[PDB]
Short mmCIF file of C-alpha atoms and ligand atoms in Angstrom, two decimals:
data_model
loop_
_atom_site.label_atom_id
_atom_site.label_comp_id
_atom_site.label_asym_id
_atom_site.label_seq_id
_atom_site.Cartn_x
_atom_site.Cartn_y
_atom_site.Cartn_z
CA UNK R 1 0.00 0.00 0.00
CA UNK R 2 0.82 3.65 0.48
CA UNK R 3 2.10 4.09 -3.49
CA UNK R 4 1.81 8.06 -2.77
CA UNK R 5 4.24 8.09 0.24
CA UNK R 6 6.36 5.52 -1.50
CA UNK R 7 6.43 8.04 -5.01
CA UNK R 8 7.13 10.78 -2.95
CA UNK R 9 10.05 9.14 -1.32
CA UNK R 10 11.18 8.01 -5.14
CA UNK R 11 12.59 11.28 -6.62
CA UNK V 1 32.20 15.67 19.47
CA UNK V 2 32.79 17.62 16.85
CA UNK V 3 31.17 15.51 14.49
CA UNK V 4 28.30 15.73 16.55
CA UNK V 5 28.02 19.32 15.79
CA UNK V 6 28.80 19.30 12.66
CA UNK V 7 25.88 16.58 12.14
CA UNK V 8 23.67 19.54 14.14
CA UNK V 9 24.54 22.02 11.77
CA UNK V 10 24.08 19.95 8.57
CA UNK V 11 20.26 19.00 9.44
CA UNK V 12 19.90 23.02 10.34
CA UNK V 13 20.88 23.73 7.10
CA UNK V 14 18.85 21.25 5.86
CA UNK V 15 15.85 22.23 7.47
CA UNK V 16 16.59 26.01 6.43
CA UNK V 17 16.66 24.59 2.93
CA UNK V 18 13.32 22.18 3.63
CA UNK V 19 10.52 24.66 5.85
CA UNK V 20 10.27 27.84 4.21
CA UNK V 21 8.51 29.51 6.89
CA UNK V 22 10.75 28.85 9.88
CA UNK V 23 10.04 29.69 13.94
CA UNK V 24 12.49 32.98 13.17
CA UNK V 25 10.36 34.81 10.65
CA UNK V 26 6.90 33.30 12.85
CA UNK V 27 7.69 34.96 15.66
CA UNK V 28 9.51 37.91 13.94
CA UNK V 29 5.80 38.74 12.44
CA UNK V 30 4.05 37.71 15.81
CA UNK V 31 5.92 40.22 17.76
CA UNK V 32 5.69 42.93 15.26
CA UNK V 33 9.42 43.05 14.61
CA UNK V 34 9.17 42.59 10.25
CA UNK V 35 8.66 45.57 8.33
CA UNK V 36 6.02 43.47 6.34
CA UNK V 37 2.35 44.52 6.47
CA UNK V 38 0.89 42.94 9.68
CA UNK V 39 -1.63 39.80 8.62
CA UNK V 40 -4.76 39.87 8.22
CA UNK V 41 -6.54 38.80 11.56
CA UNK V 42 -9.84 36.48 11.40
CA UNK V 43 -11.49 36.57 14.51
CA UNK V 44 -14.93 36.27 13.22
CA UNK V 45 -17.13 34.97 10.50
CA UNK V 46 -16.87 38.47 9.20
CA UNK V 47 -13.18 38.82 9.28
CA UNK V 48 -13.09 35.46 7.47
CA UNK V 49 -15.23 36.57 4.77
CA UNK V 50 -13.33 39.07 4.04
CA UNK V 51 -9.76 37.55 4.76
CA UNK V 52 -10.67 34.09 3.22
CA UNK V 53 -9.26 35.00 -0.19
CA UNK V 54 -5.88 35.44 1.46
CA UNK V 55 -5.95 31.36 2.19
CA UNK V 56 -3.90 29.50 0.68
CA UNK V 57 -6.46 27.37 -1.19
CA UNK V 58 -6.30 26.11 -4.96
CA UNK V 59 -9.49 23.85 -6.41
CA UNK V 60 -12.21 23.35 -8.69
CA UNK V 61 -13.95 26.48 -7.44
CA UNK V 62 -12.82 29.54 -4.75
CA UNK V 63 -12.89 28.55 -1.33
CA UNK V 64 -16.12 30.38 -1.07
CA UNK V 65 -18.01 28.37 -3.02
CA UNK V 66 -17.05 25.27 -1.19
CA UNK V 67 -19.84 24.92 1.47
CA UNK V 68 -22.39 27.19 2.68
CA UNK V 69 -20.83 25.69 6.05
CA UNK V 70 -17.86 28.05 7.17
CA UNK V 71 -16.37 25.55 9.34
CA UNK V 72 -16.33 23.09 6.64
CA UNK V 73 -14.91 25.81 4.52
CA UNK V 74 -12.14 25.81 7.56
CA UNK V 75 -11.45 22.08 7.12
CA UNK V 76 -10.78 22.50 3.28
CA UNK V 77 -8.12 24.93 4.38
CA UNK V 78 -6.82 23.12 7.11
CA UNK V 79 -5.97 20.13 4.56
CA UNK V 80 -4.94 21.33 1.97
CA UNK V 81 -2.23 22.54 4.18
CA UNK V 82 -1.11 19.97 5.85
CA UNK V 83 -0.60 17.99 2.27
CA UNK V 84 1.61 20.92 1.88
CA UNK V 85 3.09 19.96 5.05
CA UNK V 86 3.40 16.69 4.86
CA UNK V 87 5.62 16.82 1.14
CA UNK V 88 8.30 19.34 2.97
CA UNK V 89 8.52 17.01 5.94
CA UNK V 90 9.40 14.11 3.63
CA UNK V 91 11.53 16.33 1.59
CA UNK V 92 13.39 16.77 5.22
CA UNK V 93 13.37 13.41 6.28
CA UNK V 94 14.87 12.35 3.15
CA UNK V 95 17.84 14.64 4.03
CA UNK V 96 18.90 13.05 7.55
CA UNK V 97 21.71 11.03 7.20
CA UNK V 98 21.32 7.40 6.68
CA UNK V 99 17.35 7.70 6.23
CA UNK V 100 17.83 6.83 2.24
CA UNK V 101 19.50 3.82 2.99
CA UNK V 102 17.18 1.46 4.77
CA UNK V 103 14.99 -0.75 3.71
CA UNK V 104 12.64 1.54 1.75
CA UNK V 105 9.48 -0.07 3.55
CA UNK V 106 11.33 1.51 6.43
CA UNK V 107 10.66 4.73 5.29
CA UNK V 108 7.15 4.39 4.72
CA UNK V 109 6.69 2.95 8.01
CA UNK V 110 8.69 5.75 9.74
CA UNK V 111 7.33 8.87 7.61
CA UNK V 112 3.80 7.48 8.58
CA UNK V 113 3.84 7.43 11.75
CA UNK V 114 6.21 10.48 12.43
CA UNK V 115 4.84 12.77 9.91
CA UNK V 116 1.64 13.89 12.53
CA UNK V 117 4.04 14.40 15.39
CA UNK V 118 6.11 16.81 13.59
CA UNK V 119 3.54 18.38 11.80
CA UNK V 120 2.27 19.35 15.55
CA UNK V 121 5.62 20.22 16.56
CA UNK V 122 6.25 23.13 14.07
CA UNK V 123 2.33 24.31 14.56
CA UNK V 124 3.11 25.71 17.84
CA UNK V 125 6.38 28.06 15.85
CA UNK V 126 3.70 29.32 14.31
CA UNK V 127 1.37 29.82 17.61
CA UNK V 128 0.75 32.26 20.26
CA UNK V 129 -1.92 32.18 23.71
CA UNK V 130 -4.06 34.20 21.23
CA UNK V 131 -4.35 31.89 17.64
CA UNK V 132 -1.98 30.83 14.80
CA UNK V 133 -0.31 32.12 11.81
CA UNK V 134 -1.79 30.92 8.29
CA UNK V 135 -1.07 31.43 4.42
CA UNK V 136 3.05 31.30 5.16
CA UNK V 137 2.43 34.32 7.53
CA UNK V 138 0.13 36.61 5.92
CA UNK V 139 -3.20 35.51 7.88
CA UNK V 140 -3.81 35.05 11.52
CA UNK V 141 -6.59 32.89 12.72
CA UNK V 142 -7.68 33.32 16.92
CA UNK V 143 -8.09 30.66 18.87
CA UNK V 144 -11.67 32.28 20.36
CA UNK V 145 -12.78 31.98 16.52
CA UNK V 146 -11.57 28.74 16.42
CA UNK V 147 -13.22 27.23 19.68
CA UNK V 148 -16.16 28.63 18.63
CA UNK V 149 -16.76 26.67 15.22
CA UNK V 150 -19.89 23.82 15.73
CA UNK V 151 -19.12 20.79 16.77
CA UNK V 152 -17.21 18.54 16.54
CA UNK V 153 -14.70 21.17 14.53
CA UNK V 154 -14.72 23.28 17.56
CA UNK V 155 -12.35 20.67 19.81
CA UNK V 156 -10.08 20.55 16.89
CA UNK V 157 -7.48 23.59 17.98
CA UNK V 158 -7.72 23.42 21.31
CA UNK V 159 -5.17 20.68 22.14
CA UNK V 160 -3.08 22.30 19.71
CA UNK V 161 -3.15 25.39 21.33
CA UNK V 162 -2.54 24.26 24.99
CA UNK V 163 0.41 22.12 24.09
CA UNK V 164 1.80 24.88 22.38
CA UNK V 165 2.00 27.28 25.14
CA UNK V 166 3.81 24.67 27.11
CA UNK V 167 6.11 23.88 24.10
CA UNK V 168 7.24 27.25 23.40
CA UNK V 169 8.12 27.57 26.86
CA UNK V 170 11.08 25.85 26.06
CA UNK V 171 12.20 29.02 24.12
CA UNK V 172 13.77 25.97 21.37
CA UNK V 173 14.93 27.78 18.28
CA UNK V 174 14.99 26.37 14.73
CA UNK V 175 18.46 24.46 14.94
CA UNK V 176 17.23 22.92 18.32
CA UNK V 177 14.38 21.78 16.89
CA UNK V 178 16.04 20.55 13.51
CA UNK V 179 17.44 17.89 15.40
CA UNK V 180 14.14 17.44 17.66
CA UNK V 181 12.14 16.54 14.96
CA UNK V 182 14.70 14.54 13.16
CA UNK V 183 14.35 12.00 16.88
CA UNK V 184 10.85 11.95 16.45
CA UNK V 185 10.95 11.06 12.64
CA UNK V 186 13.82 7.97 13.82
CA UNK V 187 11.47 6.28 16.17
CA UNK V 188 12.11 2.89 16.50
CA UNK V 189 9.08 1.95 18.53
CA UNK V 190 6.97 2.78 15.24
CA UNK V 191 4.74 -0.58 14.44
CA UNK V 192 5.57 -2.58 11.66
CA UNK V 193 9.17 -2.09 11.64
CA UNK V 194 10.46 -4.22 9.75
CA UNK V 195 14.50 -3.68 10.45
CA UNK V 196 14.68 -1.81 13.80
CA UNK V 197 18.72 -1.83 14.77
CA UNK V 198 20.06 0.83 11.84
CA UNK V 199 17.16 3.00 12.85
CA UNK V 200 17.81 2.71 16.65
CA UNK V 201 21.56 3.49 15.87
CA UNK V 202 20.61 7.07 14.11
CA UNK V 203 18.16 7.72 16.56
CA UNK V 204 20.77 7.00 19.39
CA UNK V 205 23.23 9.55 16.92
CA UNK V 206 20.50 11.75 16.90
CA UNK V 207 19.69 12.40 20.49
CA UNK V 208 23.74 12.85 21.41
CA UNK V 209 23.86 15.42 19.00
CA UNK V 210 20.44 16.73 20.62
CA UNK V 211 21.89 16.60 24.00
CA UNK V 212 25.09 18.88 23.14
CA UNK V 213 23.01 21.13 20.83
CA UNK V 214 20.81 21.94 24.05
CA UNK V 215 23.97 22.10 26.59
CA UNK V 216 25.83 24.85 24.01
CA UNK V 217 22.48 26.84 23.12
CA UNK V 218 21.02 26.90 26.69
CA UNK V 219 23.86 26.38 29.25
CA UNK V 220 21.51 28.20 31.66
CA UNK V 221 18.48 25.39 31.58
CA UNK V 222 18.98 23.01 33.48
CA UNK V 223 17.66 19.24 32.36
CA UNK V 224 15.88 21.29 29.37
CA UNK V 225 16.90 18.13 27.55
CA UNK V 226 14.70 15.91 29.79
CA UNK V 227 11.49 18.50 29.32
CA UNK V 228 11.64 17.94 25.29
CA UNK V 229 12.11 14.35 25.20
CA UNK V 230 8.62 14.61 27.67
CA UNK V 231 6.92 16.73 25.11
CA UNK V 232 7.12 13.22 22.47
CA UNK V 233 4.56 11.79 24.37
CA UNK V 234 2.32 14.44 24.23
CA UNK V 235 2.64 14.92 20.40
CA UNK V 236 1.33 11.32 20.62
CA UNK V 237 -1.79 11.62 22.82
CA UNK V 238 -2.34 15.03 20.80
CA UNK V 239 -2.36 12.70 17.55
CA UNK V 240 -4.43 10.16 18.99
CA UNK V 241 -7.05 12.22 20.26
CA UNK V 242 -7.45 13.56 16.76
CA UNK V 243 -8.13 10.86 15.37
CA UNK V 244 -10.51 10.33 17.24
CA UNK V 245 -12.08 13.43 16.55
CA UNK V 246 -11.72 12.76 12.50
CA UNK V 247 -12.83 9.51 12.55
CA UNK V 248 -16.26 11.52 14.47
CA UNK V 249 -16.14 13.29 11.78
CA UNK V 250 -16.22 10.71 9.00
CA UNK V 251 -19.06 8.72 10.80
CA UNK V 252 -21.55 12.11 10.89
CA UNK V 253 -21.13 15.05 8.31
CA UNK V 254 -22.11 14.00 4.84
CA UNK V 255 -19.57 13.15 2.33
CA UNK V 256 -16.24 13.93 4.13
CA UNK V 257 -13.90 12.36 2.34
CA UNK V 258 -10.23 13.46 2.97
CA UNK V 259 -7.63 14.00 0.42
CA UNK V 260 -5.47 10.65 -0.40
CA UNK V 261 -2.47 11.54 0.89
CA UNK V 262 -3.90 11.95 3.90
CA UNK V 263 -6.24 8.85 3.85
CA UNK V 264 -3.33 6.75 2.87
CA UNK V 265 -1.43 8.12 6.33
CA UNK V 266 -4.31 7.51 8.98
CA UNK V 267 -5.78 4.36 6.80
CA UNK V 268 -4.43 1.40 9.72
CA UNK V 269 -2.34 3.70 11.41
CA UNK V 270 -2.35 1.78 14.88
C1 EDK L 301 -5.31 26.33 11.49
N1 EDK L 301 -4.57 26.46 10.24
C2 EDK L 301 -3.12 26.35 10.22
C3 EDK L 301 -2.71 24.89 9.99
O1 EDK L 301 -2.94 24.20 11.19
C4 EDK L 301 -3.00 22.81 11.09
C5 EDK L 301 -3.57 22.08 12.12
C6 EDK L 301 -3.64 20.70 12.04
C7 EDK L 301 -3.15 20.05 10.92
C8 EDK L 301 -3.24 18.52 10.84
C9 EDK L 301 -4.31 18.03 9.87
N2 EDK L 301 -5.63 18.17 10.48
C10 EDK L 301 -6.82 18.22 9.63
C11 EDK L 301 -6.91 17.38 8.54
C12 EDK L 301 -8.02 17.41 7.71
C13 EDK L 301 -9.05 18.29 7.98
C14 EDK L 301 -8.96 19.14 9.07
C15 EDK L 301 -7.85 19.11 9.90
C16 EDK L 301 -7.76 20.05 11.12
O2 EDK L 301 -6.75 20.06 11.75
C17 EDK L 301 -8.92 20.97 11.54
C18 EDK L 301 -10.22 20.50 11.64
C19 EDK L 301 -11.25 21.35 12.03
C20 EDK L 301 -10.97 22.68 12.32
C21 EDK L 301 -9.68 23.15 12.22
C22 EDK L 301 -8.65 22.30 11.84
C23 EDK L 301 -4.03 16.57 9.53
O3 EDK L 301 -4.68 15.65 10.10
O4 EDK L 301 -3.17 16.28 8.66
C24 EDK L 301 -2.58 20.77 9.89
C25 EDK L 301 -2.51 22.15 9.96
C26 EDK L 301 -5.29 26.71 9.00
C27 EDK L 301 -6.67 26.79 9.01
C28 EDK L 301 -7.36 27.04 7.83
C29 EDK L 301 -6.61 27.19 6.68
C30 EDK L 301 -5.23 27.09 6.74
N3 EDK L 301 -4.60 26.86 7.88
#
């Protein structure tokens, strides 16, 4: 779960 | 030792470089000491009529035209902040040394959990007995106008508020609480931890470099050191409790859905 914290930790 | 200081000064920059509205400039405009036009104060419903423009809001439609309800008109605002808040304290957690190498999971876990805390940590730079800075300074909300929104928004502040008078009492400034809020993001107690010795190392780093920051800035206050690492705690019972209050919320005022981000972070949070 949690794809949008995970993308924002991904830059 | 000296690379304990130097590790102080590195998140300061850091967090100079991640918050752009920093205790220094709150409390230069709370105490009237910026040459910038004062904000503009909402104490009322009138006041926020007229001052609403002046929040930070961007959507389908002006934040007028969101509900005929102002205090759901306050709880637009109040999110769409703290998504704002919530991207610059990942943008500063990914800066502490040694966060970007664990186990990405990690991460998750920790930003999670720790984002709430700190969120209501830097709230109270922005506080005074009498309300709360808005809109990156130029808008100041009172706490009276706040407690006296229906319920249940009306119990929303009001924690915030009374921690934050004991918080500031600390007199911390913004490289004291760098390193604060880097601890609270390193929390090893966090559930669902998957790998919990690399984390308990930094936060062990952490909290030495903590300890000397507060001895050289504040030789004069004695066991001040002791009084912050009480105030962690707190944040938590403040977070809890508003939960509670949310998940009220969900369960009785027609369709109040909150913004992903934000659904994703309480969604099985404990
Ligand atoms: C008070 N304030 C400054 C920001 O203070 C914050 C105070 C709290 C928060 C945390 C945030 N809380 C909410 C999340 C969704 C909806 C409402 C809230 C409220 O917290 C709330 C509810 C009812 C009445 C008032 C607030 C979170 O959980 O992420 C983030 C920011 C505002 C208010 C309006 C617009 C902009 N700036």
């Amino acid at each position: 779960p949690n794809p949008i914290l995970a993308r924002l930790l991904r830059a | 030792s000296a690379d304990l200081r130097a590790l102080a000064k590195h998140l300061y920059d850091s967090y100079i470089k991640s918050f752009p509205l920093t205790k220094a400039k709150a409390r230069a405009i709370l105490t009237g000491k910026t040459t910038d036009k004062s904000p503009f104060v909402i104490y009322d419903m009138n006041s926020l009529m007229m001052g609403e423009d002046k929040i930070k809001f961007k959507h389908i439609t002006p934040l007028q035209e969101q509900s005929k309800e102002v205090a759901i008109r306050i709880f637009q605002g109040c999110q769409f902040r703290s998504v704002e808040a919530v991207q610059e304290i990942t943008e500063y957690a990914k800066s502490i040394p040694g966060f970007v190498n664990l186990d990405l999971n990690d991460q998750v876990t920790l930003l999670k959990y720790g984002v709430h805390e700190i969120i209501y940590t830097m709230l109270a730079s922005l506080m005074n007995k009498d309300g709360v800075l808005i809109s990156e300074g130029q808008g100041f909300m009172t706490r009276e106008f706040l407690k006296s929104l229906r319920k249940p928004f009306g119990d929303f502040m009001e924690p915030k508020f009374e921690f934050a008078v004991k918080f500031n009492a600390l007199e911390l400034d913004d490289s004291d609480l760098a390193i604060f809020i880097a601890v609270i993001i390193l929390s090893g107690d966090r559930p669902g931890l998957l790998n919990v010795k690399p984390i308990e190392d930094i936060q062990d780093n952490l909290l030495q470099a903590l300890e000397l920051q507060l001895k050289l800035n504040h030789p004069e206050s004695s066991q001040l050191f002791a009084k912050l690492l009480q105030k962690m705690t707190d944040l938590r019972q403040i977070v809890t409790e508003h939960v509670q209050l949310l998940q009220v919320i969900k369960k009785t005022e027609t369709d109040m859905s909150l913004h992903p981000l934000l659904q994703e972070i309480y969604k099985d949070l404990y």
